[PDB]
Symmetry: D3
Subunit: 288 residues, 6 copies
């Protein structure tokens, strides 16, 4: 449930992230503060794009660091129907305007990702698929927490978060280890009981090797849909407990083709690499 | 010149940024290192998208922190025509694979922005415009240095970098100050001699007030082209020291409509907010 | 293989950790540097305790930050038979002596943990058990990387590393959620496909609920051995894909009693909470 | 001094940064388990399952304060622990309590384990009729020194040498590097000037005499047998009444009384920080 | 207005700075805390030097981090007539005494700089000059925010803040670029529309070259006053839009000689490099 | 001790972190001016334009090392400067030299300004026939203490009290909070134990006696007139010859000899760090390619 997802974000982690963002945008003197002064002010947050609202905890944490308060008129995960009054921000005018750009940039990107995730989830559901749409590690460096949180609000799985999560054996690992069996054997030893092992496979031959070697997940990468489903079918027949992930060249438009009864996970780089930010503005309307 | 832009980036700043990205992607043990081992290896960097290559100094910095070396086959800012082999990375296998994702993520986004900038610059040039296409502060939090560098590689101006660079008077500042004249007066006091003052104007009226009050730059925001140019015409005529910037609802497709002889700068939020990342892969061989 | 484990540790992570340790031990002026001077020097590292050598990469990283070099005479994971010559460190005298205490403190604790892990692994093997001895999150705050690395060198599984690794449903979670079924359902939703769910069970009845709700691992906590094995037996019979962990009151002495064919993992807080540091010294020669 | 007053030694900003690093270590990204417990206002009881001395309240409090939780203590800092004891209650949103749980217990367990060891050593020294100070050393877990030294203090031991900026310690290695005791102590005395003491690690009576002659404030008689230690300290004290004598090396709880004597001022023990088992604590939501 | 200048300082930036200063002064245990105890206490801040009071926001931030409260009896920028009771600080005794030294050190230097700036501004005004007295980047490393804020409280321009502000072309850049025209052309390309370009000139010839190539400011460096004013006059005659800055060997005593109708800015390294700290003391007078 | 050996006091990791924070302060984002100079291999000369004492080479070097530049010094650390002197060369890519320039010169200028003030005070004390130590205090620029204390040492003064973990300083504020000199010193002595000294700030013979009786290692006679200072120190040293006596408060270079006497061990001066003008240095690029 989108409203309960904020509990995932430790307050100390947010504070440090928010502080680094404010430092980036104002490393020294805030000259513009002299223009607005410190009079108690109110600003309206407007949604000018359709999509899904995501990023309230980051938006809040920015303004909290600046001694401003936010009242939300729509819950986290709400559908946005522009032009929508989303929230009021209240505080000293210079603080409101110091937080403005960082807060809007954060909300815009978080929401843009949640919107893309929601559109993919809807397309998958419309296709009658009961698997999970998932994101990837193809996130903006330093900004992963916000992007993965956005995926979650949109109803996608955050999935592989970092290199300390499940042990991912890619094509590159196979080359370095000298074969699928050797690579998976090593991965299984490293993962032990606490972590899953996933193996990126380019053919059915590779997928059977991976499964026989104890992979928890087999990632069928850059298959054509007509090859994907027969491969997954055969795999599920022989290894019923192995999960199947599809990835590579999947878009919102072709997503239904990758949906099938033997695919458990569909991961999409585009959800984080190519989701346009939503258009939000913050308008100061009263002061003193 | 794109190849000289890397000089803008202090090595200590890059190192700290790069370290934070590596910490994000691997906060504890790198379990996958045990799969590849440490054998000396090589990987080919492939460009799978058209556009402009940008972000070599960040890609290099990442691998340097991981004791790997990079040989580039194309200069920074070169056109990418897929599928193109663009670099080789050398080092211990586990180090190559530890840097892979962060390095690709960085290059993809920097290049995505450079590509959008170059398309905008080309459209403006095709329109016969001699002004500057510019970016904005609508950048991903924590990632501004990379995004601004990407704009520069693509031939756009980085323009307003942060809140300490020029004193920007926006709609909000006008409301808070109680009018354009009062806001600009205060901004000029604050800017003194070292900083410029820019004023965001939503109307002809505000634009004229800002010029008359002594702003260095007047930003004509969300004008229709048919209103923009007549407004800019009177500013250049009566205030020839003022720089005129256009922004708001500008896209690659409509950019030529915003180009005109009295417009000096066109800033586009889309160059950083809506530039799809390019497709790159790194393949051990 | 113990010698290959160092690949798990990113060099940038080590450097930051090491820098914080040096800052802790010398926050300002290093007055004692004026006593020794900067003359090129050598020191011998002596092992004065039996056990397993662990922590070379950290020891090395400390001295590297101080522009000193280490030559090891025994591989990582070696049995230590006192009094053993283990390594030589070379560099300016004051640098050797500035690194000495931090390096010895680190090696002593890493090795003390590896020694305890190796003893437990040996006792389990002597009992004919083929499961994995494992550590826990009961580590010294800020020092987890070293402690977990030590466990690995000793042949134990590092196991649960942090709160992002598998979703652990404890007694407390059960209370908060209002029951095992509700807790595990929520955990399974949060874990999705990428993470395992483990459930801490105090009784046979909780264990079955956890398995029925789809936990990947059932942790049988603070069972007597005579209750543990019958419980695990039924679990494996009815839920063949669920892994069984035993924990709670397990010591080196009683470990063989907790070993059985239906126990997959045995985790011991004592390996990190009560492993005495080994005795090492560093002597200029 | 008094255990309850020792928390004043800890600056709140230093604690906050330390606590933040610990929380980051335990949860670098998403806290998935938060979705299991939810955010309902909750309470948890802190239980002591080991005998010993309670130490580490300020760190325990700081951890929970960062997580917007409140702690009520039912025993003062430095209390004897008689298990199974109800030590405290913690209140807050369920997920915040459970996020702080492990880090808070790990910290309290180790701090108390060290305070317990220190208290046992202090008691053994007092039972021997010795009026000197039991002290710790710089043999602490890297990054955790503040907690370990605070734990020694709560147990009634001296924190003693805290870091390399505190008193100029001339060890064996310095003597080798400087080319002799006299040269090393002369240099140390120049570096220490008026603000810092000089201590010299000595392996014989002759070295101790040379060190005292050259102006050492403390002479550390290292790895002496008790039968050699006391005659050495006696002679030293006769010739240099102002010089403090420290004994260290192979001292344990069991043999501590043997190292106690009228001419020993300080007994330092690496074991108090290197070999003190953590106490068993649990935190149980109710 | 001096009282409004605190708005320039973001609270998160201050907190981080203040935290580093407290860490510098007490990296481990605060042994002296055991001497004073934690009893609620009060301490009076006394000004023992004449000058201008500056640095209240930093002083406050220090004590705020230590859970102490400050009541000021004089506004920021006030003239100090010693011996004057200027604030009271209240909090736990050990907290007051932990913040004492860092807080006094900060106020003393910020006020010393504000005092020097005010003296220079007064001398310029007494000379009938309407230009701006300015500081420079000749600030104590890590302490620039405090020093530049002190300049402002004293009525001087902070002026060039860092290397991300206006593009300064110095002697060294001219040599490296191979000439004034080349250097200024490059600087103008780098500065684009957002930033000004300033050029340090040692002759009239260089000043004209700079102005012709599009410099916004010409800095006439280490001119004798008798050479300075004729040079500025000719420059303004030909390039009316160009601002003229004078610098080099300017002191409080000789400042009026550098004042003239064609000089816009006078920058003085001495305002930050050679301003003696003011004498303040904090006297804990009550406890319990 | 010897000025050239003092750099060993400074851990390389501590310097690197400090230096990095200074560079970040001066250039938080893009270094626009780099495009003006380019990266061609260049050389610059460091010129001393003020008399005094050279101090701060390790910090100056660390700044440039972080920027991949190298420094050749023509004078040792602690050398007397007699302007105008060309004292070093720096080599590196032009943009790196010019990026480091201002921070390096600001650091050297202040370190040397303090070293110069310290050396002047030491010389005045020596000219007065005094064998005690001239010392600094904690009245240092926040965040810059390492440089300033290092500067004092190069100038021949004692760094002395470095921070709140070094010796337990009982000021008049602590006496008030504790409820009296004896109570404050007893508490201080308990906190200091064997590892730390206790110093007590006293405004009278009577307080100094109480402090010494309670076990103070140092008695700081604060803001005494010289005519009261020496008789007080004399009488106190008689009774407590193991106690060291420090004088402070209102001491200047000009009046320093009046505070010098046979029963004063340490003279601390806030002015050495609070009122030492920075020296004038410049860095002039003379070669490129």
């Amino acid at each position: 449930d989108a409203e309960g997802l904020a509990l995932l974000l430790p307050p100390v982690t947010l504070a440090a992230l928010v502080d680094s963002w404010l430092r980036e945008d104002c490393p020294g003197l805030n000259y513009a503060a002299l223009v607005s002064g410190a009079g108690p002010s109110q600003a309206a947050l407007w949604a000018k794009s359709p999509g899904v609202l995501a990023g309230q905890p980051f938006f809040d944490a920015i303004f909290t660091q600046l001694n401003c308060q936010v009242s939300w008129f729509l819950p986290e995960g709400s559908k946005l129907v522009p032009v929508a009054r989303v929230a009021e921000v209240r505080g000293p005018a210079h603080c409101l305007l110091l937080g403005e750009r960082v807060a809007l940039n954060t909300l815009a990107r978080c929401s843009g990702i949640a919107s893309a995730a929601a559109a993919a989830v809807e397309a998958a559901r419309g296709a009658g698929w009961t698997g999970h749409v998932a994101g990837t590690r193809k996130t903006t460096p330093g900004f992963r927490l916000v992007e993965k949180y956005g995926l979650l609000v949109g109803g996608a799985a955050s999935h592989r978060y970092d290199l300390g999560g499940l042990v991912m054996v890619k094509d590159n690992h196979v080359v370095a280890a000298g074969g699928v069996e050797k690579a998976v054997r090593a991965a299984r030893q490293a993962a032990d009981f606490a972590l899953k092992v996933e193996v990126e496979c380019s053919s059915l031959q590779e997928a059977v090797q991976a499964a026989e070697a104890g992979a928890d997940l087999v990632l069928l990468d850059n298959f054509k849909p007509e090859e994907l489903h027969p491969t997954a079918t055969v795999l599920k027949a022989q290894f019923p407990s192995v999960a199947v992930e599809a990835s590579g060249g999947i878009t919102l438009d072709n997503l239904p083709q990758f949906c099938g009864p033997h695919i458990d996970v569909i991961s999409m780089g585009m959800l984080t690499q190519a989701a346009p930010a939503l258009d939000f503005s913050l308008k100061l309307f009263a002061k003193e």
